[PDB]
């Protein structure tokens, strides 16, 4: 009954991976967090009444192609594809992450959620409809999050968990 969900948060540098993760765990906004730190975190939550154990891997940059690093990622059951809305290139890298995720799990069917972060900014360079379209071509939801105001943070993570249930219960 006490079930485990292993989530991986991926994305380009500065998109808010550490920001979104720490908001979910420690319930506050970290201003300037070390970009190199890659850690796992654990949190007990109640999603749709079910008490769940959340293990989240907040990835940090230097992507590697050692076998163990692949083994490290295969442990992930869901993947938050995170980009910033004021970063045109972080959105262009989304497919570069999705291809690598499918490669390590060897599957065309991997639970993922597309996340546009920093939705509190007045300046925006990535249109919402532009990301709606890309999400449909993958079959995954799209969440408009802001780690600074904690808007849609739980919504984005909880959705990834729900996208995991509809995979082991098929």
């Amino acid at each position, epitope marked *: 009954g006490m079930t485990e969900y*292993k989530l991986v948060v991926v994305g380009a540098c500065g998109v808010g991976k550490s920001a979104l993760t720490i908001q979910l*765990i*420690q319930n506050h906004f970290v201003d300037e967090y*070390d970009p*190199t*730190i890659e*850690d*796992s*975190y*654990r949190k007990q939550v109640v999603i749709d009444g079910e008490t769940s154990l959340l*293990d989240i*891997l907040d990835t940090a940059g230097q992507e590697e192609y*050692s*076998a*163990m690093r692949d*083994q*490290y990622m295969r*442990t992930g059951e869901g993947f938050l594809l995170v980009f910033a809305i004021n970063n045109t290139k972080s959105f262009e890298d989304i497919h570069h992450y999705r291809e690598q995720i499918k490669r390590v799990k060897d599957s065309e069917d991997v639970p993922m959620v597309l996340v546009g972060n920093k939705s509190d900014l007045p300046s925006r360079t990535v249109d919402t409809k532009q990301a709606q379209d890309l999400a449909r071509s993958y079959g995954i939801p799209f969440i408009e999050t802001s780690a600074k105001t904690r808007q849609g943070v739980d919504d984005a993570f909880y959705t990834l968990v729900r996208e995991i249930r509809k995979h082991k219960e098929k």
Partner: antibody
Amino acid sequence: EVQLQESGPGLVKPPGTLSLTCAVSGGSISSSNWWSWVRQPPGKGLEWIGEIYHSGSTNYNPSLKSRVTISVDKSKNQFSLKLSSVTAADTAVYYCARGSSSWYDLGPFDYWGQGTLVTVSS
Amino acid sequence: SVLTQPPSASGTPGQRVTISCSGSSSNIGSNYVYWYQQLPGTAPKLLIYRNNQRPSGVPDRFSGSKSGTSASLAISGLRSEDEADYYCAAWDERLSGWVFGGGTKLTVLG
């Protein structure tokens, strides 16, 4: 690349209390890992001391349980060791380490500090 | 040490050497075994995890296995750089603690 560095007195006189601190860099003390202390007498083998989780939960080597305290200080991103009533048998190199990953178990000691010789003498 | 290893092992270069580790039902019989390599003056380094899996930089010629209450480390392509101290470790259910073997100093002869 989380990094650990142990700091503490090099000499402790008996009845006294050995106190050591491990400063952690490149990684949060609040990650889902277990923070251990290990020691090694010079020329001899490794001996586990105890463990702490960031929630405060601990596990100690039973043979040392009555003398050992391990603490966590999140404000300084540190964990520490207190070993009371030291004797010559506590002369050793004391490593701090991180392991028991919870995301992907590699064992109890994934990353190690360098060491700092602690000599118990009169 | 709660686990048992021979204090020393020997091998001529190129040949295969074995390092044993004896436990009981509380530790090796019930739990995974991990192996660590320690060079002089440095902290130990993970060599084998979960009985037989290798981390990065650990070459093909290092292999582990576990049978019953006993474990074994095998080094085939024996090089001079393998001179080191080797330790097995496991969780002990009866003691509720991590336990080590006494360590084995490997000597490359010739």
